[PDB]
Design a protein around this ligand. Structure first.
Ligand SMILES: [Ca+2]
Ligand code: NA
Ligand code: NA
Ligand code: NA
Length: 350
């Protein structure tokens, strides 16, 4: 007396490990290769059950304490068909999966076998994205093999971090940590530059730009975000330990002032968004902290004329960055608020 195991290949040919909403994406269809099968598409809840816990993104596969949704109890059936799924806004921050199960001669239903899972990015505004990095998707890299970052609250420099919008691997050394956050009873990741920088070149600051950043709930200091407008003119945001924010303009051919009435509470996460565009030969800059617009000033380009057509965006400091996006648009108020709401609720279960 013995038992045979029979095989199924369950895939999404050409499918990716993540997609954005708001971009007109429809996934490729699923495929099952084999007595009978039942297949379909499933979408996770926003609370992973036993007070459910919030799901967090990955493009890797299960050292790590991250909790991932379990099939089938943490999922709802989206389709009984195999054809591809049109991504909708309601799917953001959830896992989408194609799965199939075998049924035997006696009607007995096996366990679901999944294709590679799809994380639907939380980012609610995709128009004009130039760079997008979610620290939760960073992986550990040893040689050419990647794996999940261990939940040890240590800065690892053997990492792989991308601009996920264009699917480009960053070459800079980017330390990342993974830790269990008690406020959410779930892990998350933070880019921890520790004084290093991430330097992005060829940015035309005459045109509309928005840089949106979510920083973590730890004390931080240093030059979180700097715009190197040209070879001699620089504008930057500097964090202090007390939570005050210093804005500095340096013209090596400026000034320094604190944002008025602003004290970041590092007990919480905080979002900082900067929108800018040139007008009348000066660069106008507006800063939103947690969705409120605290600072709205202009930087003179003539006081000798500064050509800001090929500047740099530089992240730095002793900071903890959970997510950032750079847009080649000065986003309107509605979109600034959509981003602020997303950043506030990224780790809220529901
Ligand atoms: Ca089987
Ligand atoms: Na994401
Ligand atoms: Na590691
Ligand atoms: Na729910």
């Amino acid at each position: 007396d013995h038992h045979h195991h029979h095989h199924m290949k369950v895939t999404i040919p050409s499918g990716k490990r993540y997609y954005y909403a708001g971009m007109g994406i429809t996934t490729p269809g699923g495929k099952v290769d084999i007595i009978y099968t039942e297949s379909g598409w499933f979408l996770s809840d926003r609370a992973i059950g036993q007070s459910g816990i919030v799901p967090v993104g990955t493009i890797g596969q299960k050292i790590s304490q991250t909790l991932f949704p379990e099939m089938p109890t943490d999922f709802k059936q989206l389709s009984k068909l195999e054809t591809g799924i049109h991504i909708t806004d309601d799917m953001r921050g959830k896992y989408l999966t194609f799965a199939a199960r075998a049924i035997n001669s006696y009607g007995r239903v096996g366990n679901y076998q999944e294709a590679d899972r799809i994380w639907i990015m939380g980012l609610p505004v995709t128009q004009n994205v130039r760079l997008h990095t979610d620290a939760d998707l960073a992986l550990l890299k040893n040689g050419n093999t990647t794996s999940l970052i261990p939940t040890d609250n240590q800065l690892h420099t053997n990492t792989e971090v991308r601009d996920y919008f264009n699917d480009v691997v960053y070459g800079a050394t980017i330390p990342v940590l993974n830790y269990k956050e008690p406020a959410i009873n779930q892990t998350r990741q933070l880019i921890a530059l520790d004084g290093r920088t991430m330097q992005f070149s060829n940015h035309n600051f005459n045109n509309g730009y928005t840089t949106s950043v979510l920083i973590g709930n730890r004390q931080q200091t240093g030059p979180l975000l700097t715009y190197k407008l040209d070879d001699t003119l620089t504008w930057g945001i500097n964090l202090e330990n007390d939570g005050r924010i210093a804005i500095k303009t340096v013209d090596t051919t400026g000034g320094q002032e604190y944002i008025q009435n602003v004290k970041l509470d590092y007990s919480n996460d905080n979002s900082i968004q900067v929108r800018s565009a040139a007008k009348n030969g000066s660069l106008g800059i507006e800063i939103f902290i947690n969705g409120q617009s605290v600072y709205n000033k202009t930087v003179s380009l003539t006081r000798t004329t500064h050509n800001i057509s090929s500047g740099q965006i530089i992240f730095g400091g002793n900071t903890y960055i959970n997510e950032f996006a750079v847009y080649t648009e000065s986003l309107n108020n509605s979109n600034i608020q959509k981003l602020a709401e997303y950043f506030r609720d990224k780790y809220k279960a529901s």
